């Protein structure tokens, strides 16, 4: 199961 | 033995051809289990292992939601990086991201990672304490500052030590027959004349799982590291792996050579000899 977010660079 | 769950993401811009291509894959150890491809028909996270097919619509809808969001953020990321590095709008560029967790023998947390590359070079990485960032240059230090103020390390630490490990264990259990197996290499040796005075001896390891293996040649017990042709471990396509190591042997000396095989499936390492 994935982490909920990709944090913006 | 030890185990891992990893997710890998590739985003590639393609100017004059609209939307960046986005590909996501998930692995437990050396077994792929999910994928998403932004150019595919379905627009869904999809199963790639039989043991994940049993997960219900809630799993699949939740993963699809998250993965389609990631697709969007990486599209924004590509513009951001082009802005950081002063790059033209007309070139194709690549962002890659990888994260996940390692457990030991006892299925207990060993380490977590969460790392990005831009154009095949390290950009930013969560350090092993899961609290601080390695930033390559001024651009990545720009990212580090955003992430420190948004407390991104904190959320990631919670995921990597809890949820990641918990889901790894569930998958391990659910896919027991596939994931918790150890397949010892099936081994053989071939011999082919290259001239009247030389031959190739090639030691093969086939149908093994997991992918980790050591294959070496010795001559009277000394390692022939510099003189061995060794191929990269390669997938057979049925969920097992293959590797070979070859040496060129002057005719008449075959009995001096030994091939040595180590793999977690072997109680003892194997010694093989042409004889």
């Amino acid at each position: 199961r994935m982490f909920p977010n990709a944090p913006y660079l | 033995g030890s185990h891992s769950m990893r997710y890998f993401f590739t985003s590639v811009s393609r100017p004059g051809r609209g939307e960046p291509r986005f590909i996501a894959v998930g692995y437990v150890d050396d077994t792929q289990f999910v994928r998403f491809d932004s150019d595919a028909a379905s627009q869904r996270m999809e199963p790639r292992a039989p043991w994940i097919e049993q997960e219900g619509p809630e799993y699949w809808d939740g993963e699809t939601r998250k993965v389609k969001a990631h697709s969007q953020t990486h599209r924004v990321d590509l513009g951001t990086l082009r802005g950081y590095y002063n790059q033209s709008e007309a070139g194709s560029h690549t962002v890659q991201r990888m994260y996940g967790c390692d457990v030991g023998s006892d299925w207990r947390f060993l380490r977590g990672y969460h790392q990005y590359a831009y154009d095949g070079k390290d950009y930013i990485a969560l350090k092993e304490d899961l609290r601080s960032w390695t930033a390559a240059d001024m651009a990545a230090q720009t990212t580090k500052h955003k992430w420190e103020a948004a407390h991104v390390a904190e959320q990631l630490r919670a995921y990597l030590e809890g949820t990641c490990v918990e889901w790894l264990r569930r998958y391990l259990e659910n896919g027991k027959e596939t994931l918790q197996r150890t397949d010892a290499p099936k081994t053989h040796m071939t011999h082919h004349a290259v001239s009247d005075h030389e031959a190739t001896l090639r030691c093969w390891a086939l149908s093994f799982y997991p992918a980790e293996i050591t294959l070496t040649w010795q001559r009277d017990g000394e390692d022939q590291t510099q003189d061995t042709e060794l191929v990269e471990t390669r997938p057979a396509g049925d969920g097992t792996f293959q590797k070979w190591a070859a040496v060129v042997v002057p005719s008449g000396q075959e009995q001096r050579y030994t091939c040595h095989v180590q793999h977690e499936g072997l109680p003892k390492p194997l010694t093989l000899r042409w004889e």
């Binding site: - | 890998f8 590739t10 590639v12 894959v25 792929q32 194709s92 560029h93 690549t94 095949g120 191929v231």
Partner: protein, 100 residues
């Protein structure tokens, strides 16, 4: 920017035995960027029925893909994998050898 040449291996899933069903694999790895063209050839002609694995990459960020197709080997038929990439000045053809 960074460009890495694909390593290419062509091989069968199981030890090849004439007349027995099998899969032919072309495994490309170590490459960057990810645009790559890979074909399997039977007597020099492009095999149409070819699948591939989902794009993934190694600890060093370099990409890998497995291309594959069902085949039945025979004494006569020749097989090859043809790869093109930005690091190659022309398509690289690797012939299938049953003891490789």
């Amino acid at each position: 920017m960074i460009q890495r040449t694909p390593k290419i291996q062509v091989y069968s899933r199981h030890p090849a035995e004439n007349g027995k069903s099998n899969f032919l694999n072309c495994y490309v790895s170590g490459f960057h960027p990810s645009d790559i063209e890979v074909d399997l050839l039977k007597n020099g002609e492009r095999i149409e029925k070819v699948e591939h694995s989902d794009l993934s990459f190694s600890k060093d960020w370099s990409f890998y893909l497995l291309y594959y197709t069902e085949f039945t080997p025979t004494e006569k038929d020749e097989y090859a994998c043809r790869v093109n990439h930005v690091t190659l000045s022309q398509p690289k053809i690797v012939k299938w050898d049953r003891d490789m």
